[PDB]
Amino acid sequence: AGVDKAMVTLSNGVKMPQFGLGVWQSPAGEVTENAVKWALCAGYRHIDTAAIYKNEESVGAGLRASGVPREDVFITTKLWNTEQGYESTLAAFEESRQKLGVDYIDLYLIHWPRGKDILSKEGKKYLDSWRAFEQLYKEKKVRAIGVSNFHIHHLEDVLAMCTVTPMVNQVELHPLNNQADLRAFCDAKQIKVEAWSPLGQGKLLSNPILSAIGAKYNKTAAQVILRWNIQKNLITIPKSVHRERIEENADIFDFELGAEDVMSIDALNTNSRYGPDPDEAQF
Numbered sequence: 001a002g003v004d005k006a007m008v009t010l011s012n013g014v015k016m017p018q019f020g021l022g023v024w025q026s027p028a029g030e031v032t033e034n035a036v037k038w039a040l041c042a043g044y045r046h047i048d049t050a051a052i053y054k055n056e057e058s059v060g061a062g063l064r065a066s067g068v069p070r071e072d073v074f075i076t077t078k079l080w081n082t083e084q085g086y087e088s089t090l091a092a093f094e095e096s097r098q099k100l101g102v103d104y105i106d107l108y109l110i111h112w113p114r115g116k117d118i119l120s121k122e123g124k125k126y127l128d129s130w131r132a133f134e135q136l137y138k139e140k141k142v143r144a145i146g147v148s149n150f151h152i153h154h155l156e157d158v159l160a161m162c163t164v165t166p167m168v169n170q171v172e173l174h175p176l177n178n179q180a181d182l183r184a185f186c187d188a189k190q191i192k193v194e195a196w197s198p199l200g201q202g203k204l205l206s207n208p209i210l211s212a213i214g215a216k217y218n219k220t221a222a223q224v225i226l227r228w229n230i231q232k233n234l235i236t237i238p239k240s241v242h243r244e245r246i247e248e249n250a251d252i253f254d255f256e257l258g259a260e261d262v263m264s265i266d267a268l269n270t271n272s273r274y275g276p277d278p279d280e281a282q283f
């Protein structure tokens with residue numbers, strides 16, 4: 001019933017807060033430190049970062065600045081595409097950990113499978129990366145492990161070799177790209193789906209239908225999308241560097257979208273991505 005209290009239980013029993021702050025494109029230094037501090041002070045208990053964002057030290061600094069005990073906060077970071085492989089994944093994990101200034105990381109994700117052309121030339125290095133994730137998990141260095149931007153076929157590849165099933169799959173998900181088929185698969189395999197670019201990188205916020213739905217509840221279009229995420233049982237990580245938007249985005253536990261509204265948002269799907277298609281990426 002609140003941003004600090006809404007949880008999704010992963011297949012290993014770990015409670016991951018359903019709502020988090022994304023920090024992609026938040027500059028290292030003061031901007032990231034403030035955004036993180038403001039989020040935590042507003043009751044967020046989850047921060048999503050990545051090695052490639054180069055702001056992990058700032059995430060750690062903002063957490064320390066907030067006064068909120070590290071044990072109450074869920075930190076996700078990600079292994080970058082160029083570091084896939086077994087020993088290289090272990091090394092990258094340690095680098096993230098030291099930058100974050102923590103003893104353990106809550107969730108570690110393979111950032112991308114890498115595009116089909118790279119896979120064809122270099123092999124599916126995400127599999128040996130997953131084996132490294134399994135060792136890190138065995139050694140209690142990380143509380144949960146998962147992937148990001150994996151389609152059903154990438155997931156089948158991991159499921160065929162894994163000793164631990166990926167616990168989260170973080171993918172582009174918003175009302176123009178609802179990921180219905182991937183969600184059906186992930187539900188079957190107990191893989192929780194987490195939405196990236198949930199506000200469509202900001203581009204969805206002028207949407208007539210969404211704004212009109214919001215007006216019914218004295219909420220903004222952004223708040224409608226995020227309430228839709230919550231009611232679809234998704235984990236969501238909207239990004240802002242602005243304190244007012246950070247607080248606004250979290251203020252979605254004082255209303256609920258009715259059936260017709262949910263239907264109208266579901267009708268918006270066009271399978272249109274703002275981000276790269278994981279199959280076609282040339283990185």
Ligand SMILES: NC(=O)C1=CN([C@@H]2O[C@H](COP(=O)(O)OP(=O)(O)OC[C@H]3O[C@@H](n4cnc5c(N)ncnc54)[C@H](OP(=O)(O)O)[C@@H]3O)[C@@H](O)[C@H]2O)C=CC1
Pocket residue numbers: 021022023024025048049111148149170171195196197198199200201202203205220222223237238239240241242245246248249275
């Ligand atoms: N696994 C992966 O490959 C990826 C993961 N992600 C993760 O997902 C997170 C969220 O996705 P992201 O693409 O960053 O973007 P979002 O879909 O959250 O949209 C972010 C944009 O919306 C603006 N915004 C945020 N809240 C509001 C509001 N209430 N009113 C008006 N404008 C608003 C922000 O502006 P401003 O900041 O100026 O306020 C920013 O321009 C990322 O930060 C990252 O953590 C993202 C992409 C890929």
